[PDB]
Amino acid sequence: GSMAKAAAIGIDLGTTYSCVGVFQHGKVEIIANDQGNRTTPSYVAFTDTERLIGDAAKNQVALNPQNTVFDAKRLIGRKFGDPVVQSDMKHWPFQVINDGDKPKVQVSYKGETKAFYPEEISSMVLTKMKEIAEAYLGYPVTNAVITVPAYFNDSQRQATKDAGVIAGLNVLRIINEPTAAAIAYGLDRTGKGERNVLIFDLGGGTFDVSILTIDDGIFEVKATAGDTHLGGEDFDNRLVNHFVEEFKRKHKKDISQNKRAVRRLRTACERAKRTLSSSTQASLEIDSLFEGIDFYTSITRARFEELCSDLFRSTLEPVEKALRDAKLDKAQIHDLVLVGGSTRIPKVQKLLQDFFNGRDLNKSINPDEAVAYGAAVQAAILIKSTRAAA
Ligand SMILES: Nc1ncnc2c1nc(Br)n2[C@@H]1O[C@H](CO)[C@@H](O)[C@H]1O
Ligand SMILES: [Mg+2]
């Protein structure tokens, strides 16, 4: 009669990390990759012999910075001359070239110089997310919902669809990341009446605040605000500068000019930063950090909080601006939703909860997974083809 249909997938195609989910048996499964990771770096690396995607690409970045591409989402659907592109290029070790006022990333790959459009790099990330899903499902996957930032324009949305098509995916729909996070919590399933929802999205490098109004399952974007210069990497930087000073005080040595030492310090700082979200202190233990000196120390959550205090407080400025733009008072927000791994920071949660006079924050769905979770919910809805009974 009619053969069983393959599940459709939800993909959060993130700037730094991507995430894939599938809605089956009335629930979402966020799918881990074959290294056991529930999120996959949005990285692609090129060598003389291989093209590596995800963890394999990010794990070899230190010695291959010129041919390991990341942040392609910052280039997608943009002109080479766009001022955002021109500023971002100064921070990237890989080459970005001008092809008819369209940016391309240029690398060494399999004995040749090759240039790729941002959508081609994103199609490589999408191919890995599709394979992660297929390894779990045990069959080929065709259909996907892909999410984008609410502020993406027509060109950025079309280039994201193009990336899905290059990857061999049928793109069911391009949906906004804040809308997907709201769908993850079933905030569009609460019946009749308007609900105002604030999505607080703190990423690795950027911070986005969105205000949505939901009425009978219909979403309207009321306001977007944020800070392009605020993210998890800035907190890592504060810890790096702190420990560089500490090594100077303790050993009378400046490590800041040995890239390996700085990198090993940053890697340990990011892990200590994660530990501090669950513990009140965290040890830092690096063997032979510089000149054969072992660096065995610790940091309290209170000291880390003081180090990033101004950065954490600055998340409330775009919240206030978004509320002015939406013409809403904080008491008029029905739901608060957390998105991004950096929202696990207890002090970030406390500042926002205090701002909203003690209100509960929806954080029960892993904040680095909520967007893919909502996209997976929508993908299953979009492939339904029920024929009405008489
Ligand atoms: N538990 C956690 N506590 C604090 N921060 C975290 C945590 N988990 C993740 Br993931 N992050 C940060 O989220 C960003 C995602 O690109 C990076 O800056 C990660 O360091
Ligand atoms: Mg995101």
Q: Which of 350, 255, 241 is nearest to 304 (CA)?
A: 241
- Give the architecture (CATH level 2) of 231-314: Alpha-Beta Complex (3.90)
Name the experimental technique.
Answer: X-ray
Q: Which two tokens stand for residue 249?
A: 């005080």
Report which bound ligand comes closest to the CA of 149.
Answer: 2
Q: Which amino acid, one-letter code, is at 70?
A: F
Is 226 close to ligand 1, i.e. is its CB under 6 Å away?
no
Q: Best substitution site from 274, 276, 305 to test ligand 1's pocket, by max atoms within 8 Å of Cβ?
A: 274
Angle of CA points 143, 145, 148, to nearest 5°: 150
Is 82 close to ligand 1, i.e. is its CB under 6 Å away?
no
For ligand 1, atom 13, name the residue with the nearest CA. 341
Cα(367)–Cα(149) distance, rounded to whole angstroms? Answer: 15
Backbone φ/ψ region at 100: left (φ over 0), alpha (ψ -120 to 50), beta: left
**Exposure pattern of 265-303 as b/e (b: 16+ CB <10 Å)?**
bbebbbebbeebbeeeebebebeebbeebebeeebebee
Ligand 2 mean position, distance from CA 341 (Å): 9
- Give the architecture (CATH level 2) of 1-69+125-189+363-383: 2-Layer Sandwich (3.30)
- Give the architecture (CATH level 2) of 70-124: 2-Layer Sandwich (3.30)
Angle of CA points 83, 89, 95, to nearest 5°: 135
Is 344 close to ligand 1, i.e. is its CB under 6 Å away?
yes
Same CATH topology for 70-124 and 231-314: the answer is: no
**CATH T-level fold of 190-230+315-362:** Nucleotidyltransferase; domain 5 (3.30.420)
Structural domain boundaries in the chain? 1-69+125-189+363-383, 70-124, 190-230+315-362, 231-314
> 29 near 55, Cβ under 8 Å?
no
Cα(317)–Cα(34) distance, rounded to whole angstroms? Answer: 40
Ligand 1 mean position, distance from CA 214 (Å): 29
Please give the positions annotated as active site: 12, 73, 177, 201
Is 273 close to ligand 1, i.e. is its CB under 6 Å away?
yes
Residues making up the annotated binding site for ATP are 14-17, 73, 204-206, 270-277, 341-344
For residue 20, the cross-strand partners are 11
Q: Which two tokens stand for residue 201?
A: 């999205």
HEC per residue, the chain: CCCCCCCCEEEECCCCEEEEEEEECCEEEECCCCCCCCCEECCEEECCCCEEECHHHHCCCCCCHHHEECCHHHCCCCCCCCHHHHHHHHHCCCEEEEECCEEEEEEEECCEEEEECHHHHHHHHHHHHHHHHHHHHCCCCCEEEEEECCCCCHHHHHHHHHHHHHCCCEEEEEEEHHHHHHHHCCCCCCCCCEEEEEEEEECCCCEEEEEEEEECCEEEEEEEEEECCCCHHHHHHHHHHHHHHHHHHHHCCCCCCCHHHHHHHHHHHHHHHHHCCCCCEEEEEEEEEECCEEEEEEEEHHHHHHHCHHHHHCCHHHHHHHHHHHCCCHHHCCEEEEECHHHHCHHHHHHHHHHCCCCCCECCCCCCCHHHHHHHHHHHHHCCCCCCCC
Largest CA distance in the chain: 84
